[PDB]
């Protein structure tokens, strides 16, 4: 059991790390989109003036 647990823990840790990487990428992507979104919002106000 110990052996198995060890094996599982090792697997999990590996998976967690992989997940973190995926999350990081998606957040970077979101950050970029939100910057652009804000850009459009800002642009419409100047057209109203």
């Amino acid at each position: 059991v110990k052996g198995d647990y060890d094996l599982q823990m090792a697997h999990q840790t590996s998976c967690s790390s992989r997940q973190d990487l995926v999350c990081d990428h998606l957040m970077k992507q979101k950050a970029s989109f939100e910057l652009l979104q804000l850009g459009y919002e800002l642009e419409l106000r100047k057209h109203r003036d």
């Binding site: 990081d24 957040m27 970077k28 950050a31 970029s32 939100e34 910057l35």
Partner: protein, 51 residues
């Protein structure tokens, strides 16, 4: 009206074919090549938001 036109003309001029984006060969650490200001500001804005 003239004041507004001058402002938009300045933006058009600034837009004209500008911002050399050197492909940062990742391996080439050393060449101090200076990141265009626009790239640095955008990156920083994006990084700040990411964090």
């Amino acid at each position: 009206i003239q004041y507004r036109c001058e402002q938009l003309q300045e933006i058009r001029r600034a837009s004209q074919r500008e911002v050399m984006f050197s492909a940062v060969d990742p391996d080439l650490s050393s060449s101090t090549f200076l990141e265009p200001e626009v790239l640095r500001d955008v990156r920083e804005v994006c990084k700040l938001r990411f964090k």
